[PDB]
Every structure is written in C-alpha cells, then in structure tokens.
C-alpha cells in the first residue's frame, strides 16, 4: 500500500466486490489530504466493521495505518454506522459503503519522501480508475480532484453504446480510429477495439491495455502477438493502440487465437 493509487486500487475494487454499479472516487491535494470512495454496493453491519480493521485484509492494511473513516448502511433497514482512526458511532449515508480516508502516511517520514510529488500521483490514481473503468462497463465511476469533478465514466446498459465512456477513458483521438473485434473459437471469446495502424499517430501509442476476465495482467506474450499483427498487415512497425477483452474457461494456443482475431478486423 506504498503508492496513493494503490490505496485507491484496493478500495475501488472493495466496492466492485460488494456488487457496486456506482463509485464516487474523490481526492484532494493530489491524494495527500483526501481519499474518499463512496459506492451503492452492499453495506457492512456495526458488528463486522470493528474487527475488519483492528476485503478485511485490505481494510486493516490501511485502517490503523491511517485516519480511516469507514461508514456504511446495510440495504436491510438499519442506521448508517461509522468508524474512525477504532470508534463506532452512527452517521447517515445511502445503501452501500464509504471510505473518506486521509493519507496513509502518519508515523513514516521515509514514506513522505517516497511520495513522487503530486498531480503526477493523481494522474497515477486516474490510470487505476481508467484501467478499472474499461474492466467494468456496468459500474458508473465519477472521479473528482480538489472537489473539482474530473472524469465521468457512466455505466452503459447491457450490450449498449460503449464508445462514449470508452472515449471518455481513451480521449477523442482513439474513439475515431477504434475498430471493434469479435473473435470466437470454442471456449475462447475475444472482444474489444484496435486503432487502424494506417492512421495510428504518436498520441494514440499511449494506449496499450489488455484485460483477461476483469483482471489486467502486463504480459509480454501479448506484445509479440499484437506487434506480429501490426507488422504483417502494413510494412511499418510503430507503437500500437488497442483495448481488448478475452474470456477463457477457468498459453501458446491463446497467443495464436489473439493474432488471428486482430489481422481479420484491420482489413
């Protein structure tokens, strides 16, 4: 839990695991003086709150290590209970859970030096959300900084228009060049988008993201498979731009499944 974006990552995930379709992720002073995650997920009882801190792994990994203010109201008729620092008294909050947490950094001087300025650190927080956003197209995420609402990733209906939010995450540049992919061989199902290598510019080359059953894994296997496909359509071998989604039944065959899916879409 060393980077401020790490705290986010865990906590934003903690909402998704509670079955959340709305995430209010809020920050101030580039994540140094506010880290707030509010959801419309499932609430947590006054009982389970206490010893979760004193998901229960991550909550405790930050709770007594920060000024953590964990409040929630169970969907079942109750009164929103609220913790601090190890003290439960009731607040009033909607169905779900909220962690208006201040900087983990408290008794660690060296961890302040570890802080890589800020603005850059909320730009890293943005990337966490930006990634998580593409993983879950069913969850709404409104990202804010300094009280200023920054980015607005609104939940698309099941098999709806994905491009707006996609374009919100990846800017207008990619959205224009976005060529959709739909490959399927047995248990393996590949979906997503690719920018046309003909009109691929330096700005688009910043986007290289690959999601496998929700979780993103930065694996070099996929880099070969993609830069094999980007080479064997047109001669030029520049930096690609893509966002792709593979669903598999819970390696080298998968590599070949990927490559074949791309080249057919581009032409």
């Amino acid at each position: 839990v060393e980077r401020p974006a790490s705290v986010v990552k865990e906590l934003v995930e903690n909402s998704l695991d509670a079955g959340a379709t709305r995430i209010d992720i809020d920050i101030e002073r580039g994540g140094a003086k506010l880290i707030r995650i509010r959801d419309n997920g499932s609430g947590i009882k006054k009982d389970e709150l206490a010893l979760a801190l004193a998901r229960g792994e991550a909550l405790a990994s930050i709770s007594s290590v920060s000024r953590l203010t964990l409040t929630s109201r169970t969907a079942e008729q109750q009164e929103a209970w609220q913790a601090y620092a190890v003290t439960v008294k009731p607040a009033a909050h909607p169905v779900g859970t909220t962690l208006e947490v201040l900087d983990l950094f408290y008794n660690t001087p060296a961890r302040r030096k570890f802080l890589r300025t800020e603005k850059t650190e909320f730009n890293h927080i943005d990337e966490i959300i930006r990634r998580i956003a593409l993983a879950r197209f069913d969850v709404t995420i409104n990202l804010s900084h300094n009280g200023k609402i920054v980015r607005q990733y609104r939940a698309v209906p099941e098999g709806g228009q994905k491009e707006r939010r996609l374009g919100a995450i990846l800017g207008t540049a990619f959205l224009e060049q976005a060529l959709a992919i739909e490959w399927q061989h047995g248990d393996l199902t590949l979906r997503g988008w690719v920018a046309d290598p003909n009109h691929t510019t330096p700005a688009l080359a910043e986007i290289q993201y690959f999601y496998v059953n929700g979780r993103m894994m930065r694996d070099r296997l996929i880099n070969h498979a993609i830069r094999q496909a980007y080479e064997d359509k047109l001669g030029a071998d520049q930096q690609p731009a893509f966002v792709l989604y593979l669903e598999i039944d819970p390696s080298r065959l998968v590599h070949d499944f990927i490559y074949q899916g791309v080249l057919s879409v581009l032409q």
Partner: protein, 661 residues
C-alpha cells in the same frame, strides 16, 4: 346576471396601473398592465359600471368608449395620500403584507379609488379588509423573500457561491450566465415552451461536450452588439465578434445531426453572417490594440489608401540609417546617432567632445548634459512626411472603423437574434451538461397542482456537501395539499422544503430536475419565509396564495410567547387546508401542530427521523410518516461548540420542565 363593479386607472412615463371594487362582496384588487392591449383586455374583462380617470390621462382612447366614466383630479392619484389613507383603512403600518407595496403605478389607481369609495359610500366598509397584486405573467409570481432564501443568484451573505446559479452556471460565456439567471427569476409556466426546452436538453445531452468549447470562443457578443449600436465599439470587441462568426459554420454542422425540431429552429435563428465574417477577416488585424485611438487596427489588403499612408511611415528606419551612416562617414564623428523623440521629433545626437566638430548644415534643436542634438532640412522634411502620414492613415482608420458600423447595422437586429440564440444555446447545452453530469430527470406537467418526487434531492446542497444527499420522496396533490415537517435542527426540515422549491423552479425553466423522477402540476406563485418583518411576509402569502400556489412557510412561531405563534401557525395551516387549499409546506418546530392531520382534511404528518446513539446523534435525513419524537437543540448545542456543562444544565433544567409534560 351581472354585478355593479367599480374601477380606476392611472399611468406614468413607464406603463399603466389599475384597481377595482365590488360593493356587494367587498373584493378590492390591483394590477400594472405594461402595454395597451393588455390594459384594454383588463377593462374588457372586469367591465366596471363606474370607471375613474385622472384629468391628465394620456391614452384616453381606452376609456372614451366605456360607460359610467368619472373625470377626477391628479392629486387624488398621488402615492403619498394613497399609501397613508389605505394603511389606516386596513389599519396596517405598511401594505407589504398585501404584496402591493412596491407597485406604486397601480396604488395611484387603488389610492384614488378608495378616496372615491370613502366619498361615494361615506359609510363603514369593513368588507374592504384587504388588497392584493396580480402580476399573473406566464412568469411565476415570486416575492424577493424566495430569491434571497432559495439563493437562486445570491446567498444570505450576498455572494454568488452556494447558489442555484453557481451550480447551473458552468456556462462558458457571460451572456449565457445572464440568460440562465433571468430564466431562474422569470420561470416559464407555458407548458408548451417548457416541453420545447426539455426535448432540446434531452437531445444535446450526448452532444453537450463537443459544442461547449466552440461556445467559449464567442465571448459576450450580446454586450458587444449594444456598444456597436451606440457606435462606441472597441477593436478587441470586433475581434471577439469575428472569433464568434468563425464558429457559426462549425455549430451549424454539429446541430444539423441532432434530432430535435426546437434545436433545428434555434439553429436557423442562429443563422450565418459569413458575409460579416469575410468583412471583419479582411478589414481587421488578427489581434489589434485596445483603442482605435492608437491605430494598428485595420489590416493591409482591405483599403488601398490605408496601405499608401502606411507605406510613408514604413519608409522610416532605412532613411535614417543611411543618413546616420553617410553623416558619420562625412563628418568623422562615430558617436553620431539618429533617433526619435516623442517631444521634439527626430534628431542627430553627437557626444559633447565631438559636438562642436559638426558641420554648418546642422541647426541646434536640443542641448543635453552629455551631448548636443541637432536638426537638418532633409530630416525636418522627412519629419513632416512621417508625422502627417501617421495622422492621416490614423484619421482614415477612425473613419473606416465607424463606416464598418454602417455595414454591420443592417444585420444589427439579426445579430441580436443570433446572439440571444447563441446565449440560449450556451444555457441549454450548459443545462444539458448539468443534467448529464448530475443525473437529472425530465419532469412532466399535469393538470392539477401537485409535485410527485421519486428519490429527489436539493440541487445545490447535494453539490457542496462532502457526504451524499439522502434522497427524499414527496407526494403533493389537492388531496395531500399540506405537510407538517416537524423535526431536529440538521433534521432536513429547511432542506426538504427548499429542495422542493428549487425542484419546482428548475422544472419551470424546462431544465432537467434534481430527482430520479418528478411529475408536477400548475404552480403559479412561489412564496417563501425566513428570519431577518415576519408577520408582514406571512400575511402577503395568506392573501396572495391560491389553490395552485406553492407555500414554503419556515418556522412560523418565532413569536412573543409559546401561545401566539402556535395559535397563528395552527390557524394559518387550517386556513390553507380549510379555505385556500394551496399546496403548502409548513416546516416548523411545533410538534403541537402534529394534531392537525386528525383535525384537518388534506394535512399530513411527516418528520425527518433522527436516532440518537451514545452522547452524539445521527439524522437519517429521510422524510417519514409521523412527527418529531423529542427536542434536539440539546444534541445540536454540543455540535455548535457550546460547553457540555450548560448542555448538562440544559438536560438538568429539561427534566425539571419535561416532568410536567
């Protein structure tokens, strides 16, 4: 089946003022029809059997075809006597509690009618017990008490932060900020016009982001056109106008794809003045200086002769360099430098040691401490061609610049329409962005007065509050036409009341409302009350409010004793449930009023449930069917900082008082 009705009318330089009286019933009323046809329709409507007019009435044509006419003096229609006489007639110290105090044009008619009534009748007329103003514009009738309380444009302090403006005012251009502000002080109630906006706002929800940067380029075109009409426009104003003209091809393309006939209409009203674009592009430099006084405004290529007189002033530096060089060679003085001076003009300066080694051609202009400056015929000749060419090129610049007013003013009207349309687009697209951003719904209008909110929220409070707004449901109708909202401080008494008031107003600017779902009925008058006077405003609401009016009574009961404010609140609630049947909201601390839902038909008990745990407290902020459980100032007192020892003395004195009841 007609009655004997009496009336009076008077006018100033501004408009007209009107008043009436039926001697059978005792109904006395007031109005200020601004135009003629409205005034003619008002006489035609009431149809008085006896009609007053002041000897010097200008627009006589109205009354010369009416019956039972009465020529009256002027002094009778004077506001001083009118106010004084009518105050003592009703027995008040002011006519603020009739909502006519700041309608002096109409009070001249009312004042003259009563002085005539007191002279026509000359008996006791207690039937005349009240008057009321009826600015029944499609615009909603709102006392300034509402605008200062709702904080539409101004908070309690006097700033424009934590307003409905501040929130909705993410408008890119100032003329958008102002049309937004005017809409909020003049809510449209023409259900057709409101639906025109709601269909517009729904279609631009998707395209909101792309249009907004294009609108930020325009600037305040509306106030630039006002200076253009005055013939006082500045170059930097015309630069903004050109920058705006370039965006019209772009906006005509983006809005062409959008599916909304109102949008396609506004797109045509926007029009295109690409002819005026061409003129200003050719005429003016990309970014000229502040004033026309300084010149350097009109670009080269527009006027041949501008460039001619410029070419004289441009052949300057090379003429002086070759002089400076030749005269440095010829004399043998290397400190010789030819430069300009605003005061004296051009000159030839030589160092004091080399000064008197200069030739006989040189005439002394300026003696310095360190040098001797001179002037020669060739310079003094070249001095003339510059100084005059500057002025004549600059004079041509002033004349051309005013001539551009004669080229633009033919479209002046069309540009105001375009500017209004562009300003309206910024508002609508801004609201389309706000409704997209803040997840607002389209409220649909019904026939009878009533607001049905589904998980609604305070459009301002939710935005600035760190925590989420606890959404509140509402069901107002002529069946449920009043809600006794008893509760704690930080209960949400004031919030749920004022949240309802904004929802109505926001719904009546055709803008998407802060709620999951709203269905709302006719609300003509929005009347509001808050502590600074008190009784003055409440009475106005009593007299003015109708079956359709929205009443927002806040803590009536800040009184002389427990009894005078409970008794009045109980009577006012009865009145608005028994007689008037207005859509009424009566947030209050009087739990004794919670005996009215059993007393009255139409009144309903609601409360903002608060659950106290430990020493501290939680406020659910959710409206529940019932009443307040206990007092909450004790719980709040600590939360306002107060030492716990007088909270202790409060709880120690509480149980001495609570032991009785």
């Amino acid at each position: 089946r007609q009655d004997n009705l009496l009336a009076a009318i008077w006018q100033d330089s501004k408009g007209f003022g009107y008043a009436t009286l039926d001697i059978s019933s005792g109904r006395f009323r007031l109005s200020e029809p601004a135009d003629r046809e409205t005034m003619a329709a008002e006489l035609q409507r009431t149809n008085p059997a006896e009609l007053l007019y002041a000897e010097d009435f200008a627009e006589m044509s109205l009354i010369e075809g009416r019956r039972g006419l009465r020529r009256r003096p002027l002094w009778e229609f004077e506001i001083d006597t009118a106010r004084q006489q009518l105050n003592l007639q009703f027995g008040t110290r002011d006519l603020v509690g009739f909502g006519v105090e700041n309608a002096p044009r109409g009070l001249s008619a009312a004042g003259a009618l009563l002085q005539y009534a007191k002279c026509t009748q000359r008996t006791t007329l207690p039937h005349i017990r009240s008057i009321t103003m009826e600015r029944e514009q499609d615009s909603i009738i709102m006392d300034a008490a509402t605008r200062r309380n709702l904080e539409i444009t101004q908070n309690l302090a006097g700033g424009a932060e934590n307003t409905l403006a501040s929130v909705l005012d993410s408008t890119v251009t100032p003329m958008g900020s102002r049309m937004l502000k005017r809409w909020l002080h003049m809510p449209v109630r023409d259900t057709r016009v409101l639906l025109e906006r709601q269909q517009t706002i729904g279609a631009l929800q998707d395209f909101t982001a792309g249009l907004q940067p294009v609108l930020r380029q325009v600037g305040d075109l509306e106030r630039i056109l006002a200076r253009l009409a005055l013939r006082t426009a500045r170059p930097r104003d015309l630069a903004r106008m050109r920058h705006a003209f370039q965006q019209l091809p772009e906006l005509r393309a983006q809005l062409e794809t959008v599916d909304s006939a109102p949008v396609q209409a506004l797109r045509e009203k926007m029009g295109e003045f690409a002819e005026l674009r061409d003129l200003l592009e050719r005429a003016i430099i990309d970014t000229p200086p502040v004033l026309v006084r300084d010149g350097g405004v009109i670009a080269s290529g527009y006027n041949e002769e501008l460039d001619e007189w410029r070419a004289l002033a441009d052949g300057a530096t090379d003429y002086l360099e070759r002089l400076e060089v030749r005269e440095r060679e010829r004399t043998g003085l290397d400190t010789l430098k030819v430069g300009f001076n605003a005061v004296h003009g051009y000159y030839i300066q030589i160092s004091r040691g080399q000064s008197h080694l200069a030739p006989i051609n040189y005439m002394r202009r300026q003696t310095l401490k360190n040098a001797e400056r001179y002037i020669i015929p060739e310079l003094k000749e070249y001095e003339d061609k510059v100084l005059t060419s500057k002025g004549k090129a600059l004079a041509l610049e002033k004349q051309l610049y005013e001539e551009l007013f004669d080229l633009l003013l033919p479209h002046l009207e069309a540009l105001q329409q375009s500017a209004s349309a562009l300003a309206e687009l910024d508002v609508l697209v801004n609201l389309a962005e706000r409704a997209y951003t803040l997840n607002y719904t389209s409220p649909t209008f019904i026939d009878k007065p009533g607001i049905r909110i589904t998980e609604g929220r305070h459009p301002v409070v939710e935005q600035v509050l760190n925590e989420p707004f606890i959404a509140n449901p509402l069901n107002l109708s002529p069946q449920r036409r009043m809600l006794i909202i008893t509760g704690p401080n930080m209960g949400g008494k004031s919030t749920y009341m004022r949240q309802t008031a904004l929802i109505a107003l926001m719904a009546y600017i055709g803008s998407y409302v802060p709620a999951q779902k709203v269905e709302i009925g006719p609300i003509d008058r929005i009347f509001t009350r808050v502590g600074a006077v008190e009784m003055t405003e409440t009475a106005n609401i009593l007299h003015n409010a109708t079956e359709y009016s929205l009443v927002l009574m806040d803590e009536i009961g800040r009184g002389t004793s427990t009894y005078d404010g409970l008794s009045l609140a109980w009577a006012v609630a009865e009145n608005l449930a028994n007689k008037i049947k207005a859509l009424t909201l009566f947030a209050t601390h009087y739990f004794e009023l919670t005996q009215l839902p059993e007393k009255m038909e139409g009144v309903a008990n609601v409360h903002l449930d608060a659950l106290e745990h430990g020493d501290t407290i939680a406020f659910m902020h959710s409206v529940q069917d019932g009443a307040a459980s206990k007092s909450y100032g004790l719980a709040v007192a600590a939360l306002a900082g107060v030492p716990k020892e007088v909270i202790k003395r409060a709880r120690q004195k509480l149980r001495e008082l609570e032991s009785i009841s």
